[PDB]
Every structure is written in structure tokens, then in C-alpha cells.
A paper describes a structure:
3HB6H (EC 1.13.14.26) is a NADH and FAD-dependent monooxygenase that catalyzes the para-hydroxylation of 3-hydroxybenzoate to 2,5-dihydroxybenzoate, using a Tyr-His pair for substrate binding and catalysis. The crystal structure analysis revealed that 3HB6H has the conserved fold of group A flavoprotein hydroxylases, but differs from the other family members in additional binding of phospholipids. The fatty acyl chains of the phospholipid ligands of 3HB6H protrude into the substrate-binding pockets, whereas the surface-exposed hydrophilic headgroups are involved in enzyme dimerization. As a main result, it appears that the 3HB6H family uses phospholipids as a common tool to increase their dimerization strength.
To shed more light on the role of these lipid guests, bearing in mind the different lipid compositions of Gram-positive and Gram-negative bacterial membranes, in the present work we produced Rj3HB6H in a newly developed R. jostii RHA1#2 expression strain and, in addition, 3HB6H from Pseudomonas alcaligenes NCIMB 9867 (Pa3HB6H) in E. coli. Biochemical and biophysical characterization revealed that Rj3HB6H possesses similar catalytic and structural features as 3HB6H, but contains PI as glycerophospholipid ligand. The three-dimensional structure of Rj3HB6H was solved at 2.3 Å resolution by molecular replacement. The isoalloxazine moiety of FAD was refined with full occupancy in the in conformation. Similar to the crystallographic analysis of 3HB6H, no substrate could be detected in the active site of the enzyme, despite presence of excess 3-hydroxybenzoate in the crystallization drop. The protein crystallizes as a dimer, just as 3HB6H, and contains a phospholipid molecule in each subunit. The electron density of the phospholipid in the crystal structure was refined as two acyl chains, one of twelve and one of seventeen carbon units. The phospholipid is located in a tunnel, which runs from the dimer interface to the active site, and interacts with the opposite monomer. The phosphate group resides at the protein surface near Arg350 and Lys385, and the electron density of the headgroup is consistent with the presence of a cyclohexanehexol moiety. The crystal structure showed that the inositol headgroups of the phospholipids are located at the protein surface, and that the sn-2 acyl moieties are in contact with helix 11 of the other subunit.
Residue numbers in the entry:
A (entry chain A), B (entry chain A): 3 to 397
Write the structure that this text describes.
Amino acid sequence: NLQDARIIIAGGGIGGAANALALAQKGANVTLFERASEFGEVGAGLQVGPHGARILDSWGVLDDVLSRAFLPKNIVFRDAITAEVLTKIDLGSEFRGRYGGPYFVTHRSDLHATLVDAARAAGAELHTGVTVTDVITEGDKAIVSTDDGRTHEADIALGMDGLKSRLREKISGDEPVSSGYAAYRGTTPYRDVELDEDIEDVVGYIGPRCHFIQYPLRGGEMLNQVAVFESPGFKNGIENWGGPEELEQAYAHCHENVRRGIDYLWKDRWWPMYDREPIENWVDGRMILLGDAAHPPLQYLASGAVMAIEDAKCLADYAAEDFSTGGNSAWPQILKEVNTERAPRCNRILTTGRMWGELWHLDGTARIARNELFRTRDTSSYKYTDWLWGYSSDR
Amino acid sequence: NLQDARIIIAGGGIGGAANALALAQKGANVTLFERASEFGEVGAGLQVGPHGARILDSWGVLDDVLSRAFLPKNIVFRDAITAEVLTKIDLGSEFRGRYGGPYFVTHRSDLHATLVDAARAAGAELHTGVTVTDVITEGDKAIVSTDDGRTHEADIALGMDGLKSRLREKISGDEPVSSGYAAYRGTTPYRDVELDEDIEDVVGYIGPRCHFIQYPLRGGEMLNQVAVFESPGFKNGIENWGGPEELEQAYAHCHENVRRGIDYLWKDRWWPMYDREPIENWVDGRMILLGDAAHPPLQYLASGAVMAIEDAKCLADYAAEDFSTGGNSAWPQILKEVNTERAPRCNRILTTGRMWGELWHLDGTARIARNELFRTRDTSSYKYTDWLWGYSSDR
Ligand SMILES: Cc1cc2nc3c(=O)[nH]c(=O)nc-3n(C[C@H](O)[C@H](O)[C@H](O)COP(=O)(O)OP(=O)(O)OC[C@H]3O[C@@H](n4cnc5c(N)ncnc54)[C@H](O)[C@@H]3O)c2cc1C
Ligand SMILES: Cc1cc2nc3c(=O)[nH]c(=O)nc-3n(C[C@H](O)[C@H](O)[C@H](O)COP(=O)(O)OP(=O)(O)OC[C@H]3O[C@@H](n4cnc5c(N)ncnc54)[C@H](O)[C@@H]3O)c2cc1C
Ligand SMILES: [Cl-]
Ligand SMILES: [Cl-]
């Protein structure tokens, strides 16, 4: 266990919160700083596959999370132009038995609040309204500086400050890479959505230069909707690219079921999709980057938060194993071994994520080949997903 | 039978020759004009699937054709970059039993000379060095005019003057549509080709913006090679586009096995690939367009000559059925019914041919989807080919 260990965490997103929980359950002294004045996430959906669900269960928060979540029966891919079913992934008992947990969807906000509360209950000291301005290593401590003039000593620091991380600059000067696709969200009361059929699945309509995703939340009361389209604005160098004026032209070619959905999206806010080129080294002395700071993906595999949750389990588990026997001295070896386990796993998600996305968005004859590939696959095979959903950091 | 029928044929390619044979065996009086001073075809390979082979057998020339032909065991598709096998079509006894004949390859010249000789032996009067300058219909005859000042009377005329048909202009003012791909050919003595493995198959290497095809001829003594690549020259408006100066850059990205092959191609002559938009009506009075005059395809399905051979059987069969009972009067009804049978069949080849070609030439993620589609298909299924190889005009 981690009794005498002091850890500081810069950033209190899903990733920071999950690390505070995982370390604090091991007996670590955890201090986390979050810039915004409250802990909060977007009131829209996210997907958490069994690779996350397992981990949440091992912290004892899955039952609670599930009580406010939705359990879809399948992931259903449809053609965005014809609305025809291309294939299904069955999320039933075979699926759960193979991967050790359910595939679920919930409100990001509720998942987030659940992790913050349990991290608090486990002993983490969380601070809102505090910006980390610098981290350096000196001797065998991490020295962390905040925007209220104070400095702080810890055994290690976690840089969990997101896609636009400033702590990343200690390790790499790369910048976010635009995909040229923008995401819009919406949650609707379920009844109030004009639906031809009912939805108890995660449904992905995939089309030339767009996609459209739908799933129920909170026991089938609301329906989460997500639209992702290639921005003509981005190619012409617009700075605030992907605005709602592009929406109607982007989906004009698509099936009515897809076009109906555009109306329910929040138009006052959207998410341009950037990621970063994969990097191998995430450690600077006694600082490690985790979460989106280390490995921000495009969202086609629905796995970025999950990756940050894995980061949390791997770090907590590996430190608990080596700290008991090696003390504060052992911290850099711990970080290196976390880095080594986590880098290939996460970097394959970033790279494969890009290829998966391109596969969704193909046109012409390429679309016809892709449709046929999907329809005719062996649905009892798990070769396309074991690497994703069947990973574990356990050694 | 066709005893009292007089038919004139403008053009003595594979298609004209095959029609002279088919009509003359029914007892028709056949006159064919060929522009060039000799009957002759390119001394390079072509492929004749069972949809052609059957028909050649029913004229009694298949045994003879096969005695100088090659019988491949499979059609093997490989990736042009890795040289990996993607899939095979088995050409064995199941294949032959289902489709009623062999898939074979031979020299175009030898197939051509075989059809000319049998058409002669069957009573067709063939004339070289004679250009048809016009065909009109007047009353119940076709009036055909030649470049030696003469005119000629017949019950019907066949416009079989090729891709660049001038007789087509009576029915349509459309022009050939460039694909932007050029084909090069080569026949090598088999031994003299540097081969890693031996080849007893039709092999197609398919790659981004190119392909490369190889098969043995004449009992495995020579190896036919064909290179097809997208011409940068064509996009920039070059008039004589697709020259051999493009070859090395076109295949630079491809596997060594593909690059080795470029060296054996004839460089003094190449074939820019044009086709035409499909048309429904091929008949002007007592003239019918057939062969490439009516339906010129891109060569990805290896079926243009075959289509002209089918044209021959269908016309001969349908006329033999209706002429015996209805005489010269019946000729326009005969042409219409030939047209109606043949148009959808051939026009699906032109359109699907284009899509098939695009499928060969895909790049990036589209290439990865296509490769995987090919590898994982059900090889006992015949759904991708029945429509092609299992067609018959018989009613
Ligand atoms: C449209 C969309 C859909 C998605 N869907 C899914 C999905 O379905 N499933 C899934 O698993 N993932 C999904 N993701 C990815 C997922 O949202 C992210 O990977 C994940 O939230 C990253 O969490 P994080 O804690 O590492 O970073 P963030 O959530 O960005 O949190 C960083 C935090 O640090 C704070 N901060 C920044 N700088 C400082 C500083 N100097 N000091 C203190 N605090 C600071 C920020 O305020 C923020 O709270 C999606 C992403 C998008 C864009
Ligand atoms: C690279 C390549 C590979 C191919 N491979 C294959 C294959 O493997 N299998 C296959 O089945 N098909 C193949 N084809 C297609 C095939 O070659 C043609 O579809 C077929 O030859 C057309 O025959 P045709 O008799 O209709 O026209 P053509 O062969 O063009 O013959 C027309 C004839 O009429 C003559 N002529 C022109 N004008 C006049 C006039 N006014 N009067 C008299 N005569 C005239 C010409 O001299 C010529 O001899 C391929 C084509 C190419 C370009
Ligand atoms: Cl994601
Ligand atoms: Cl052809």
C-alpha cells in the first residue's frame, strides 16, 4: 500500500478524479488541483466499454454508476445514406463473460461526480479554483506551483491537464493536430424525439464525410445524440471552424432519419476534433503525464476517458506493488514502468482510432467495399475487438 | 435456319468474325468487310471465361482453340504493394460443371484466325482492304456503301466497327470517355522472365492507382504480362497521354515482383483505356450495332470480346428461330429482340466494370478494407460471379 506517499494531481477531469480515487484507496496522501471553480462535466453522454467498467467495479463504484446509467443490448452500425443495418456487436452475457464487465453509457457529469465523491470519501483532498502554473523535480521530490503564489512538495506529480496541457511542454513542443471534423451533441427527452423505431442500442450511422450516433441514457428517459462531420470551413483556414451554419449542407446527402437528428443538437457549443501524434515518453523526473495530456485521441473508439481510468488503475497498482518494498526512492522506476506498460496500449488506440474513423467516412466504391465487409464478417469472432476490450494492465 | 437471308457485316475483329461464323453455320449468306489489308489481331493474351467458352464449343471450335490455349487453375488476386494473396477463384471441375465450360487464356491472334477460318469454311465471304463508308435502310433492305464506290443490298447490316465506330453516329453522338488509365502489354518466353515462383494461374496484383496481370499462354511456353496505371499526363490534358516515360514513377510504390515486370513490356505501343456510357437502343432500321460499337467496356472484367461472341450467338439463335417462320419481313422484330436481350446484360458489364476497376485501385484505409473483404469472403459462394459467368441468351 501507499501510506507514506504524497501525490499531487494537476487537473480534475475524469482522469484526475479517477487517479485521486485509485491512489487514495491504496492509502496515498493525495492533493488534487482543478482550475475551474467547480467540478463539473458536460451533461451529455459517454460510452464506457468493459475495459473501463471492470476497473470501476474494482474500485467499488460500478453498481452505483450503473444505477444511473444505461445498458445497451448492441452496438448497431447503419449506413448513413440508406439507414440499412450493416452489422451488430452483441453486448449480452457472452460479451460480458469474455471481457469481465458490461458496455454501458451514462452522463459524463454523473460519472464524474461519482468519481469525485468516492475520491473524497477515500481521503483525497480536492481543491477547485486552483491553477497549477509549474512542476519541477528537485532531488527526490516534485515541486508544484499554483496561481495563488504557493509551492507544494510531493513524491510525484501527475500532469492531467487535458488536450491543451501546458505541463506537456516540459516533454514535447508538438501541437494539437486538427482532424477537420467537428462534433455536436444533444440530449433530448426520449419521448420528444421523433423516432420511427425505438432505440435500446448504441446506434452509429456512418456516411461519406459524416456520422451520427444515438443512444439512450438514464434508464431510457433521454436519448443522447452526436453528430460528427468534415468541416469545409477548416480546409479554408477559418479559425473558429465547424460552426452550425455548416450543419445542414454536411448532412444533405444523408437519410431522413439522420437529417431529423440535426434539429435536436445544441447549436451554441461544438467540439472541433483534434488529437496528437503519439509519444513514447510521458515522464519528466517525478512528473508523469496521464489522460488526454499524454494520449488525446479522436473519439471513434469511445475510449479516451477509459484510457485515463486505465492509467489510474495501472499507476495505483504498480506503485502499491513497488512502494511497500522500496519507498520514495522507488518512484521514478514506478513511473517508467507505468509509462512502458501504458504508452503502446494507448498509442495503438490513437493510431487505430484514426484509421477506424477514416473507415466510417469513406465514399463511392470504397463505401460499397466497406459496407460489404461489415455485413459479411464472422459475428462470433472477436479478433477486431479483443485488443481493445480484452486488455488488462495486471502483471 | 437462315438459307435465304443475306447479312453484311462491317468490321472483321473478333466480333465481326464471330458473327460471320454464327450466321454462316445457320445457312445465311454472309458478306463481311474488313478495313485493314489483312485479318489480324495483337499477338498478346486475352482471357475467355466460360460465358465465351460455351459458345465456342457450340460452334465446334473450342477443342481446336484449346489445343493452342492455356487452362489456368485459378484467378489469384494479390496486393500490389506486399505481394500477399488476397483471394482465389478456383477454375477446377466444380467451376466448369456450374458454368458449362473452362476459363481459358490464349493469343488474341490465334483465337481470331480460328474464327475467321471456321467462318470461311462455313461459307462466309470475307473481304479485306474494304472500308464501309455508309449504311442506310430503304424499304426492307439495308444498303451498304464501300470505299471502292460500290453499294450492296442485304436483309440486315451489322455495325461491328469497334470502339471508334463511325456507324454508331447514326444512333448516338456520344464520344469515348477516358478512364485516365493506360494499358501496356508484353509476351515473354516464360523461361526468360525472372520469376520467384512458377505461374500456372491468372495472377492480378492490384494496387493504388495501378494493377499488374500475368498469365501463361500456349501450354506454359510464354507468359503474358499486362500493366495498367493511372496517367498523370491525362489529368493535365496531354493528347498522346500514357507514354512509357510515366511507367517507372507509376509502379515505384509497388512490390519488386511488380516492378520487375515493367521491363518486359512492349514500350513502342500502348492502349489508353476509354469506354462509353451505356445506351439502350442499338438498332437503326435494318442496321444493328454489336461488339465494341455497341458496348465498349474497360477491361477489368475481361469480357468485351466475350460480349461480342455472345452477341453473335444471340443474333444467330434468335434469327434462326423467327426467320424460318416469318422471312425477310421478320428482320426488324429480330433485331429489336436481340437488342432487348443484349442491352441490359452488356450495360451491366460496362457499369459494373467501372466499379470493379475502382475497387482494384483504392488507396489508404479503403485499400485496407478492400483487402480484408477479399481475404475473408466465403469462397464456396458464387454470388459475385453467377451474373457474369452463368448468363445465357437461351430462351
Ligand atoms: C465529442 C467527444 C466524445 C467523447 N466520447 C467519449 C466516450 O464516449 N468515451 C470515452 O471514454 N471518451 C470519450 N471522449 C474522450 C474523453 O472526453 C477524454 O479523453 C477525457 O475526458 C480526458 O479526460 P482528462 O481527465 O485526461 O482531461 P480533461 O477532461 O480535459 O480534464 C483536464 C482538467 O484539468 C483542468 N485544467 C487544465 N489546466 C489546468 C491547470 N494548469 N491546473 C489545474 N487544472 C487544469 C481542466 O479544467 C479540466 O477539468 C470524448 C471526447 C469528445 C471530444
Ligand atoms: C488491353 C485490353 C485487354 C483486353 N482484354 C480482354 C480480355 O482479356 N478478354 C476479353 O474478352 N476482352 C478483352 N478486351 C476487349 C476486347 O479486345 C474488345 O471488346 C473486342 O475486341 C471488340 O471486338 P470488336 O470485333 O467488337 O471490335 P474491334 O476488335 O475493334 O474490331 C473492329 C474492326 O472493324 C475494322 N473497321 C473499323 N472501321 C471499319 C469500317 N468502316 N469498315 C470495315 N471495317 C472497319 C477494324 O479494323 C477492326 O478490325 C481487351 C481490351 C483491351 C483494350
Ligand atoms: Cl474517445
Ligand atoms: Cl474487356
